[PDB]
Amino acid sequence: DFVKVEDLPLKGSMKFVYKEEHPFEKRRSEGEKIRKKYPDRVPVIVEKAPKARIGDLDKKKYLVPSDLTVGQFYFLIRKRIHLRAEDALFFFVNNVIPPTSATMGQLYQEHHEEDFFLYIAYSDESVYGL
Residue 45 pairs in a beta bridge with 61, 119
To one decimal place, what's the resolution in Å?
1.6
Residue 119 pairs in a beta bridge with 45
The whole-angstrom separation of Cα 63 and Cα 70 is 14
Assigned CATH class of 1-130: alpha beta
CB 55 within 8 A of CB 79: no
Closest CA to 90 of 53, 118, 115: 53
CB 44 within 8 A of CB 120: yes
CB 46 within 8 A of CB 130: no
Distance of CA 36 to the CA centre of its chain: 22
CB 13 within 8 A of CB 53: no
> Domain map of the chain by residue range?
1-130
CB 107 within 8 A of CB 118: yes
SS3 sequence, the chain?
CCCCCCCCCCCCCCCCHHHHHCCHHHHHHHHHHHHHHCCCEEEEEEEECCCCCCCCCCCCEEEEECCCEHHHHHHHHHHHCCCCCCCCCEEEECCECCCCCCEHHHHHHHHCCCCCCEEEEEECCCHHHC
Closest CA to 45 of 88, 128, 108: 108
CA dihedral of residues 36, 24, 98, 122 (deg, nearest 10)? 120
